[PDB]
Amino acid sequence: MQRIKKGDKVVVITGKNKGGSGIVLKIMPARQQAIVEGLNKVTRHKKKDQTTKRAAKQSTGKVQQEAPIFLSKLALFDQKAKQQTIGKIKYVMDPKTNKKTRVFKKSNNTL
RNA sequence: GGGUAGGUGGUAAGAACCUCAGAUCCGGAGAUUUCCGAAUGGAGCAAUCCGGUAGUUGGAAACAGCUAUCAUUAAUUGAUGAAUAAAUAGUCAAUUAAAGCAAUACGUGGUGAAGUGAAACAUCUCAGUAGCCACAGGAAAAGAAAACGAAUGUGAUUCCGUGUGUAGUGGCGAGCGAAAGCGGAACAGGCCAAACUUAUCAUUAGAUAGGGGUUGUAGGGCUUGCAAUGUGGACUUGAAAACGAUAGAAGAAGCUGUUGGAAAGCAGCGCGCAAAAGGGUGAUAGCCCCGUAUUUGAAAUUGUUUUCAUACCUAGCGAGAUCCCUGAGUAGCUCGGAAAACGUUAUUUUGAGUGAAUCUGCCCAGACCAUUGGGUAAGCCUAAAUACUAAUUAGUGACCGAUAGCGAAACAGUACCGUGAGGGAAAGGUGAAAAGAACCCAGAGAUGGGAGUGAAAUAGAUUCUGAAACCAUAUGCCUACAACGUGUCAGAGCACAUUAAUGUGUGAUGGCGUGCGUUUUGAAGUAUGAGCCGGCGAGUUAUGAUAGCAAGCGUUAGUUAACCA
RNA sequence: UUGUGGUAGACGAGCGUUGUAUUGGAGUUGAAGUCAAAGCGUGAGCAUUGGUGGAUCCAAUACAAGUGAGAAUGCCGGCAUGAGUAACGCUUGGGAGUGAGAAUCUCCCAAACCGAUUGACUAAGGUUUCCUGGACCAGGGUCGUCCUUCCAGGGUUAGUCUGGACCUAAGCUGAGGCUGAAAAGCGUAGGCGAUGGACAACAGGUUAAUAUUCCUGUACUUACAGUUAGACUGAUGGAGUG
RNA sequence: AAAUCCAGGUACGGGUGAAGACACCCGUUAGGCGCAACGGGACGGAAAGACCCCGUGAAGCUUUACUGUAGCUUAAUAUUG
Ligand SMILES: [Mg+2]
Ligand SMILES: [Mg+2]
Ligand SMILES: [Mg+2]
Ligand SMILES: [Mg+2]
Ligand SMILES: [Mg+2]
Ligand SMILES: [Mg+2]
Ligand SMILES: [Mg+2]
Ligand SMILES: [Mg+2]
Ligand SMILES: [Mg+2]
Ligand SMILES: [Mg+2]
Ligand SMILES: [Mg+2]
Ligand SMILES: [Mg+2]
Ligand SMILES: [Mg+2]
Ligand SMILES: [Mg+2]
Ligand SMILES: [Mg+2]
Ligand SMILES: [Mg+2]
Ligand SMILES: [Mg+2]
Ligand SMILES: [Mg+2]
Ligand SMILES: [Mg+2]
Ligand SMILES: [Mg+2]
Ligand SMILES: [Mg+2]
Ligand SMILES: [Mg+2]
Ligand SMILES: [Mg+2]
Ligand SMILES: [Mg+2]
Ligand SMILES: [Mg+2]
Ligand SMILES: [Mg+2]
Ligand SMILES: [Mg+2]
Ligand SMILES: [Mg+2]
Ligand SMILES: [Mg+2]
Ligand SMILES: [Mg+2]
Ligand SMILES: [Mg+2]
Ligand SMILES: [Mg+2]
Ligand SMILES: [Mg+2]
Ligand SMILES: [Mg+2]
Ligand SMILES: [Mg+2]
Ligand SMILES: [Mg+2]
Ligand SMILES: [Mg+2]
Ligand SMILES: [Mg+2]
Ligand SMILES: [Mg+2]
Ligand SMILES: [Mg+2]
Ligand SMILES: [Mg+2]
Ligand SMILES: [Mg+2]
Ligand SMILES: [Mg+2]
Ligand SMILES: [Mg+2]
Ligand SMILES: [Mg+2]
Ligand SMILES: [Mg+2]
Ligand SMILES: [Mg+2]
Ligand SMILES: [Mg+2]
Ligand SMILES: [Mg+2]
Ligand SMILES: [Mg+2]
Ligand SMILES: [Mg+2]
Ligand SMILES: [Mg+2]
Ligand SMILES: [Mg+2]
Ligand SMILES: [Mg+2]
Ligand SMILES: [Mg+2]
Ligand SMILES: [Mg+2]
Ligand SMILES: [Mg+2]
Ligand SMILES: [Mg+2]
Ligand SMILES: [Mg+2]
Ligand SMILES: [Mg+2]
Ligand SMILES: [Mg+2]
């Protein structure tokens, strides 16, 4: 399975942004990146191009989007625990459904 | 089958979809596989053209779709059948194999030079090398003594060390160079012909299909008995098990502060280890991530080994007879060549000719004869150790790091050159992240100057660092009566202030002064080589000999080579 | 105390580069590289500081070398000198327009050369160079708003034309077969092979680009089937013509 | 653009010198730098002299040079009575 999936809450443990909590919107496995909303906001200088029906307007000024972040800098956020902390996860397989599930190793919380 | 939550191959954003009834992706097994190409229906200027036959569907037929088949050679079988009665030649049909390619590499065989060395050259060497051709194989070749060879001897072949640069062979010159023996790697021996016998062929068999036999301290057959039902194979089918190969699963351990754009660096306090190999993460991470040690797992295909059964092959010691068999245009011999270390010679081989004997036999022990001894030619097959790497997996390097390393880090045998065979380059790096510069000004625009992002824009796509030759700008000094290898020793004036040093920059003027390498008796040279700058560019390696120096071991010393772990 | 010129040459002692092995050390508070400066050594050489640079490097003792560049009419790359020099490879003037910019582009009027040709149709070859619009990185021996250059789109219509589905010449290939150490060479029957033979379409119009091909008009030729009438049909071979 | 180019700030007379000097010795002359000319010199440039000699170099050709050989011719022998 994968450490980070599309949807789970995640934070950053290194870089300029420390303790930045967000939701992963999309995961690129090949480049080992991850787009997390609200973090790594870059502002491309949007030019103007008019060669299509939609390009006839293409209103783009100082649009702030999302920059991808290396998957190593991401860490899963705990929610079930009363005192939330950042830890590592296991890949135990519960015989109830025989499906692999991530479980933290500093607690007993699933996913 | 594995495995998930993403995917629609790269320069690549966007549009539109797919995907949790399990996608994309990885592995095993299959399906489809246009045309040329061995190309094989016929042709042909390769990727084109023109068909025949037998079916089936439309048409009223020509015709047009949709299928299968149609080359040559060799072997077997059957039919037909000339000159010419029979019979062959030939013709036709059916079945089974062969064609070709590549691994710039190993094997075998045929053919086979020259440059060169001998300080010339012809014998010789180079060299049975290059090249040309044929046939393979996963290896090939060789192979079970008519042997070595001098002994109370060894007992297929192959490969390694030594014997040794020894015996020898050489216009006895240049050179060439074994076979024994010894030490090792591996080890395996089997099977036909003939006798004799069985059955069948107008049985003129001298032929076909079986039993019997495979030799040297001779064997086998003929007749007559005892003991045997086993052990082992280079061996067929099956069944079972184990070890693997082709995807994978799990897989421990860290926070705080400081410089910094960013920590993983540094410091403090800890923790894990059968994991401190490696890669990435904004610098240099055992504990951030992927992994690694370790424990594991295969539906399907495939490899090795073992066990059981089952085919096939596989068996001893006597007696008598005195009879038969033991590989012929063969061994020898003569005339020309060759192979072996040998430049032809005892041994091996053959183009021409001739030509034997049959265990009281034949061959051999470097001419030859006799004695002694060794071995059984003229028939076949044979695993292992041995040779090599185009390719698949893992990994290593006192190997290279864009003039190096493969010619080719990029889309390189490309661009390009030549009718053709053939010849054959150069070229890598933005930033952590494109956040790739919106906007303003000048300009026709590219572009430039600001702004903005960024730690850095003198990192801006001309994109890591940026040397010299070369071209321009400028502070300071000097230079327009001056004979100059352009420098050196003295020396005013001018202008500054340093790796603080009897300082530095320029140099009115005085004295002296014909470059650097090469090759020469002798070069400023009217001898030669270099336009300048930068990179590259020429005493090595392997095997032996001698001598110097040093160390280890020593007076029945010293030291191993191959090979094994 | 005696000495210390020196080529060929002999001998001895050292420096420097890259990497490896052992120790220690420095580095985003800035390493290598790289530039400058008024330093230290007997020599190869070695430091200090500052600028640039952005991640490795240094000292000691040993070991191994693709280990030292000024010359080879040396190889490769760059840049000078000659020198803004020779040369720019046969064809004039003006008006109007476009354009930011015009001797060179567009149009018009002349002018000058070709006129058995610089005119027109095609074979061979070339392979999109053809037409339209746009552009002025590069190429054009100047310039360029323009080009046979570049970009985007488009363009080649056959029963009668040129060649196959027809035929042969030189020649090539060639089952069998002959010859030859091998590869192969020769060659019969067959099969290819035009530059030749046989075979039915002419006139005009149309698009920016095609036209005996598209369109209009008028024709012709060869096959197959049905039908009417007549006739016995007569080749893979013989003969004539070709 | 081009061949060329050791660095140049590149006079003349007599002498000297590797024997014919822009550079040496002794004298004479000459302000700095171009442009257009013409070729005296720079033993000018282009071509590692083709002439000559040397090399125990190469190649072509010749012959009663040497050693061989294709082909031609003669004999023995086998096919061969
Ligand atoms: Mg599946
Ligand atoms: Mg010779
Ligand atoms: Mg010689
Ligand atoms: Mg010689
Ligand atoms: Mg064999
Ligand atoms: Mg895993
Ligand atoms: Mg882990
Ligand atoms: Mg690490
Ligand atoms: Mg003999
Ligand atoms: Mg020999
Ligand atoms: Mg005997
Ligand atoms: Mg003897
Ligand atoms: Mg015998
Ligand atoms: Mg290269
Ligand atoms: Mg380069
Ligand atoms: Mg070509
Ligand atoms: Mg800028
Ligand atoms: Mg540049
Ligand atoms: Mg740069
Ligand atoms: Mg003066
Ligand atoms: Mg005067
Ligand atoms: Mg003077
Ligand atoms: Mg003077
Ligand atoms: Mg002076
Ligand atoms: Mg002087
Ligand atoms: Mg020198
Ligand atoms: Mg001389
Ligand atoms: Mg001389
Ligand atoms: Mg001179
Ligand atoms: Mg000369
Ligand atoms: Mg010379
Ligand atoms: Mg020169
Ligand atoms: Mg140089
Ligand atoms: Mg010694
Ligand atoms: Mg001396
Ligand atoms: Mg070192
Ligand atoms: Mg520095
Ligand atoms: Mg070198
Ligand atoms: Mg030049
Ligand atoms: Mg110039
Ligand atoms: Mg001139
Ligand atoms: Mg002139
Ligand atoms: Mg001129
Ligand atoms: Mg002209
Ligand atoms: Mg003119
Ligand atoms: Mg005229
Ligand atoms: Mg014309
Ligand atoms: Mg073109
Ligand atoms: Mg045009
Ligand atoms: Mg145009
Ligand atoms: Mg131009
Ligand atoms: Mg028509
Ligand atoms: Mg034809
Ligand atoms: Mg014709
Ligand atoms: Mg036309
Ligand atoms: Mg030039
Ligand atoms: Mg004199
Ligand atoms: Mg000469
Ligand atoms: Mg000679
Ligand atoms: Mg010679
Ligand atoms: Mg004769």
A29 in contact with nucleic chain B (CB within 7 A): yes
Chain B positions with an atom below 7 A of a protein C-beta are 3-7, 249-255, 261-264, 280-282, 285, 288-290, 433-439, 452-453
Strand B interface, A 73-92, C-beta < 7 A: 73, 75, 86, 88, 90-91
**Protein A64 CA to nucleic acid B251 C1', in Å?**
41
- Method by which the coordinates were obtained: cryo-EM
Give the Cα-Cα-Cα angle A15, A104, A87 (nearest 5 degrees): 20
Beta bridge partners of residue A86, listed in sequence order:
A77
Q: Are A77 and A11 in contact (CB under 8 A)?
A: yes
Q: Are A76 and A10 in contact (CB under 8 A)?
A: yes
Ligand 13 centre distance from Cα of residue A3 (Å): 85
Query: How many CB atoms sit inside 10 A of residue A76's CB?
Result: 20
**Exposed/middle/buried for residue A9 (C-beta within 10 Å: 0-12, 13-18, 19+):** middle
> Domain residue spans in chain A?
1-111
Distance CA A44, CA A11 (A): 24
Count of residues in chain A: 111
A48 in contact with nucleic chain B (CB within 7 A): yes
